[PDB]
Symmetry: C2
């Protein structure tokens, strides 16, 4: 199983459900490879986004100088160790108050709802990933 | 064993020298573990910094909402998987520093001060430091 990218899917995300997204980072085309996941409150792509999750597959490295006490122009790059992306499982579990965000089974964040989870109507997954599965589990 | 952190060291950085820093990241005490290396142009706390290298050991993740076409308050965290020991080499060339992590060149930083202006090295934040040396 392999899915097109960008991937768009009508969804219903009640409390207790989890959005499972598995894939592999593609590190060979862009300098800052990332994964982006959007929960839309409607079906047009000008509808509101109740929740966006963006994950950078590299490590940020930031370089600058400080002259007269003032930090100057920041130069940034993304350190990519290994050019084989590690496969990942993204799990977004829907709780009453928040989305519980898990990467490879490890909770990294709890994003408090800014819309009722019932208002989410569509999911979009795209950028620098080879997509293996996208499903709604309970 | 670990060298003291912060680690501060008077240095001379001629073209052709490399700043070699090895150590292991410490991932268990702060949400955003980093390594910070500063090249100072004098020996004082207030001195100018000719070059700062800051590396995040985690993967940044950013979350937000978009309402009425406007992105709102961005919420940020860092995914820390699995730290493996690292080697950072900052190679001093005529026109730039060549930044090397684990033997991989990741960036060429154009000099903003003459590298002869650098007088002091400082290394600190979330690392167990193994070696700091300058080799020519
Ligand atoms: O660029 C080096 C300096 O950055 C400062 O933090 C930056 C930071 O990189 C950025 O994300 C922004 O949001 O805040 C600061 C820019 O004003 C550090 O505090 C400073 O010590 C230097 O590292
Ligand atoms: O929340 C991330 C958000 O960034 C967008 O670009 C923004 C950005 O928030 C900001 O730096 C600046 O003000 O311009 C844009 C509008 O605010 C991305 O377009 C979007 O996909 C998100 O990733």
């Amino acid at each position: 199983s392999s899915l097109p990218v960008p991937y768009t899917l009508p969804v219903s995300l009640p409390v207790g459900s989890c959005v499972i997204i598995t894939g592999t980072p593609i590190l060979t085309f862009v300098k800052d490879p990332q994964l982006e996941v959007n929960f839309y409150t409607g079906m047009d792509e000008d509808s509101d986004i109740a929740f966006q999750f963006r994950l950078h597959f590299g490590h940020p490295a930031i370089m600058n100088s400080c002259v007269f006490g003032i930090w100057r122009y920041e130069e940034k790059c993304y350190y990519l160790p290994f050019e084989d992306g590690k496969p990942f499982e993204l799990c977004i579990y829907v709780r009453h108050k928040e989305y519980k965000v898990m990467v490879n089974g490890q909770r990294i964040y709890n994003f408090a709802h800014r819309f009722p989870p019932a208002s989410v109507k569509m999911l979009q997954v795209f950028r620098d990933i080879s997509l293996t599965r996208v499903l709604i589990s309970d």
